[PDB]
Amino acid sequence: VFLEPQWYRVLEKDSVTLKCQWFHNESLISSQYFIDAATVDDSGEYRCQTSTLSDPVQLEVHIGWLLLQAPRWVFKEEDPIHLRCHSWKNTALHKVTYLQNGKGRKYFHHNSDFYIPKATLKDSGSYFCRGLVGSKNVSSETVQITITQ
Amino acid sequence: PAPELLGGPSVFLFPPKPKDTLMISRTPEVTCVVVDVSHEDPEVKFNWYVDGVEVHNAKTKPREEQYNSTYRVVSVLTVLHQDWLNGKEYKCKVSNKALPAPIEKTISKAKGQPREPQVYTLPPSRDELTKNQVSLTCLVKGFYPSDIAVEWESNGQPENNYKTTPPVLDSDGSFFLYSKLTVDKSRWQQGNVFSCSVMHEALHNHYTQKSLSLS
Amino acid sequence: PELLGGPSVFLFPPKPKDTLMISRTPEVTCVVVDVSHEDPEVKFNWYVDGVEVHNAKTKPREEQYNSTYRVVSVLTVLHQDWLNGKEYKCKVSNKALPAPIEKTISKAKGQPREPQVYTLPPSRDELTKNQVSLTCLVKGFYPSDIAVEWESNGQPENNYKTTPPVLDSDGSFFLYSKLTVDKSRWQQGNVFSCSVMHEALHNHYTQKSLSLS
Ligand SMILES: *[C@@H]1O[C@H](CO[C@@H]2O[C@@H](C)[C@@H](O)[C@@H](O)[C@@H]2O)[C@@H](O[C@@H]2O[C@H](CO)[C@@H](O[C@@H]3O[C@H](CO[C@H]4O[C@H](CO)[C@@H](O)[C@H](O)[C@@H]4O[C@@H]4O[C@H](CO)[C@@H](O[C@@H]5O[C@H](CO)[C@H](O)[C@H](O)[C@H]5O)[C@H](O)[C@H]4NC(C)=O)[C@@H](O)[C@H](O[C@H]4O[C@H](CO)[C@@H](O)[C@H](O)[C@@H]4O[C@@H]4O[C@H](CO)[C@@H](O)[C@H](O)[C@H]4NC(C)=O)[C@@H]3O)[C@H](O)[C@H]2NC(C)=O)[C@H](O)[C@H]1NC(C)=O
Ligand SMILES: *[C@@H]1O[C@H](CO[C@@H]2O[C@@H](C)[C@@H](O)[C@@H](O)[C@@H]2O)[C@@H](O[C@@H]2O[C@H](CO)[C@@H](O[C@@H]3O[C@H](CO[C@H]4O[C@H](CO)[C@@H](O)[C@H](O)[C@@H]4O[C@@H]4O[C@H](CO)[C@@H](O[C@@H]5O[C@H](CO)[C@H](O)[C@H](O)[C@H]5O)[C@H](O)[C@H]4NC(C)=O)[C@@H](O)[C@H](O[C@H]4O[C@H](CO)[C@@H](O)[C@H](O)[C@@H]4O[C@@H]4O[C@H](CO)[C@@H](O)[C@H](O)[C@H]4NC(C)=O)[C@@H]3O)[C@H](O)[C@H]2NC(C)=O)[C@H](O)[C@H]1NC(C)=O
Ligand SMILES: *[C@@H]1O[C@H](CO)[C@@H](O[C@@H]2O[C@H](CO)[C@@H](O[C@@H]3O[C@H](CO)[C@@H](O)[C@H](O)[C@@H]3O)[C@H](O)[C@H]2NC(C)=O)[C@H](O)[C@H]1NC(C)=O
Ligand SMILES: *[C@@H]1O[C@H](CO[C@@H]2O[C@@H](C)[C@@H](O)[C@@H](O)[C@@H]2O)[C@@H](O)[C@H](O)[C@H]1NC(C)=O
Ligand SMILES: [Cl-]
């Protein structure tokens, strides 16, 4: 039950690849999985078998220009927080800002991942990203990140 | 060449002309304009909504090749005079293959208490009367919203040699404007009565007229 | 073509009033936004008609609420240079720009034309109201750069608004400025003046009075 890439939140037309140690929404599949170009229906619960029966692994396919991706949303103090501002069809994104609690925290001329190497309590809040695709101003939905000790 | 269009189409949604909403004889329209439509994905699907309820009476215009190698694609929706002035919201939903989702745009009349225009005609300055042409002035103030139409007449016939300033926000949050009608001095000296016609929602019958002549 | 991300540059002219009154200093302002923390160094080269000039006063970079830097350079300008139509060029260099960004501005071109200025009292119908409108009509001017003001007993009047320039059918501009005053002051016979500053007036200045008669 491994995701390649690790992003569990993806965007329509993203390639996902799933690995084993299938049941799509507790139901049989076409082969014994490569998603070539996602849609909203590719969302939901996923499990695998050939060995035992795996845990549940959730995949959210979203619709939008931008999607703020993280490996998870709950982090220990001093853990590294890796945020990716993912654009639809990997469309070139420029003048990119990652916001926290409605304030610009980090700015990039060209789309770049915003890596925080050592999480602190101060890193909790709602995050989103925005940027320019050509001359269109676009933003992602917000996500909540919480930090514990 | 052809431009890159990384963000796909953009939408601009425009209101009816003020006079069109105020005269029952005329046909007010909301116009949904889509630009940066590529040659490869040139189809645009329009859905229209009035206060969230879908309507089906829009006119679909033929697409227009622009000089930058894009299409301009337009849908026009005729509205009801009362709905616009009562503040219904007009929603244009634009679908196109180059986008991740539909673009939605909404427009309505500006909100806030309507205020009646006060209308004042002002003769030419004594110093202008040495010229061959003179300026007749119409001041329209104290009005809200800014949507207003202004015209001139003399003796039942339109006078068109005029220019009107845009609306200007005054210190009390109302608007004012000025309209300047330029006439031949002979016509003013003869005693012809000129009139400044103003149309606005807060006027009785949406119409008032003030006149101006020599004394 | 079009360019990708990087700093952006905006170049602003002097205030019209500052270019016409010799007691004032006109400035040309080059603003650079979206400067990253990673490459915050910004160099300004300033050219007048082609000739590099130094003497531009560069403010130090300022942290914006969105986590970018903004840097302003201000070139003081000679009144007559701006009026004679000289081009002012701002060149901005920075490591994140592949090529430096250049911006040029100057006074609008075309044959200057003298405003005529006419003051107009309130309509008789407005004399019913608590306040009244004194109107200043300014027409025949070119270019649109202008400043208009109201005065009484050598002090500026507070409560006035001026329309933007509107293009007349002959290619010149007009506007109206409305001064609102309490009716008492008008009927007591106080004198009000519309002042107009434009490059095509003698001494870049004229004024016209208005009072009850
Ligand atoms: C490729 O080319 C195309 C076309 O190019 C053009 O042709 C070539 C040859 C060039 O010369 C070029 O200059 C020409 O434009 C490009 O298309 C243009 O794209 C830009 C954006 O990039 C558009 O810019 C917007 O303009 C809006 C105003 O547009 C009107 O006015 C202009 C003139 O100023 C006209 O040219 C337009 O066509 C619009 O005119 C109106 O059209 C209506 C419909 O026809 C008319 O209403 C109807 O009229 C009929 C009768 O005719 C009936 O009466 C109906 O009842 C009635 O409905 C209307 O009368 C008419 N008005 C006229 C003629 O005056 C701007 O509003 C808009 O600005 C907003 O958004 C900007 C974001 O880009 C932002 O920066 C601004 O701040 C502003 O933001 C808004 O601000 C207001 C308050 O001020 C707020 O309320 C808003 O909330 C706020 N935000 C918003 C809305 O998000 C744009 O500047 C331009 O319109 C468009 N041109 C055309 C012709 O469509 C294209 O970009 C090029 N692409 C590339 C990649 O190069
Ligand atoms: C991160 O933040 C910064 C700044 O943050 C800001 O503060 C926070 C809290 C927020 O509130 C945020 O919104 C604030 O901006 C962001 O920086 C902004 O970046 C945008 C671009 O993304 C800039 O937008 C341009 O603005 C121009 C207008 O700017 C003036 O007016 C606005 C208000 O409307 C002010 O806020 C500005 O500061 C500017 O104000 C002027 O400043 C002058 C210099 O100081 C003053 O002149 C001087 O005055 C003194 C007296 O004090 C002396 O007298 C001097 O002599 C005199 O020089 C002047 O008085 C003052 N005017 C005022 C207050 O009115 C727009 O012109 C510009 O539009 C053009 O370009 C667009 C392309 O982006 C295009 O779409 C438009 O259609 C238009 O097109 C051009 O038109 C011109 C002219 O007609 C033509 O030359 C060209 O043909 C044409 N195309 C071009 C050039 O391509 C933009 O809208 C914005 O200015 C800037 N703000 C600041 C403060 O710097 C930043 O974007 C954020 N980054 C991210 C990633 O989020
Ligand atoms: C597997 O189960 C998941 C989880 O329920 C399914 O995801 C859901 O898919 C539907 C339609 O594909 C989504 O509905 C759509 O979105 C909005 C909801 O606001 C609705 O208004 C639209 O009309 C549209 O029907 C739904 O949101 C989505 N839910 C989540 C949480 O992702 C998935 O489709 C299932 N897959 C299969 C193959 O059965
Ligand atoms: C983008 O715009 C921000 C806020 O504007 C709002 O969002 C965009 C998508 C437009 O639809 C606009 O009409 C909305 O009101 C600005 O504060 C910000 O500076 C811009 N962001 C960047 C990264 O340039
Ligand atoms: Cl400015």
Residue numbers in the entry:
A (entry chain C): 10 to 30, 42 to 52, 56 to 73, 76 to 174
B (entry chain B): 230 to 444
C (entry chain A): 232 to 444
Q: What does the article say, verbatim?
A:
Among these applications, antitumor treatment with therapeutic antibodies is primarily based on antibody-dependent cellular cytotoxicity (ADCC), which is promoted through interaction between the Fc region of immunoglobulin G1 (IgG1) and Fcγ receptor IIIa (FcγRIIIa) on the surface of immune effector cells, such as natural killers and macrophages. The Fc region of IgG1 possesses one conserved N-glycosylation site (Asn297) in each CH2 domain, where a bi-antennary complex-type oligosaccharide is expressed with microheterogenities resulting from the presence or absence of non-reducing terminal fucose, galactose, and sialic acid residues. Namely, removal of the core fucose residue from Fc glycans causes dramatic enhancement of ADCC through improved IgG1-FcγRIIIa interaction.
To provide a structural basis for the negative effects of core fucosylation of IgG1-Fc glycans, we determined the crystal structure of fucosylated IgG1-Fc complexed with FcγRIIIa at 2.40-Å resolution. Because the sFcγRIIIa glycoprotein used in the crystallization had a homogeneous glycoform exclusively exhibiting the bi-antennary complex-type oligosaccharide Gal2GlcNAc2Man3GlcNAc2(Fuc), the ambiguous electron density of the Asn162 glycan of sFcγRIIIa indicates its conformational disorder, presumably because the intermolecular carbohydrate-carbohydrate interaction was weakened in the presence of the core fucose residue of the Fc glycan.
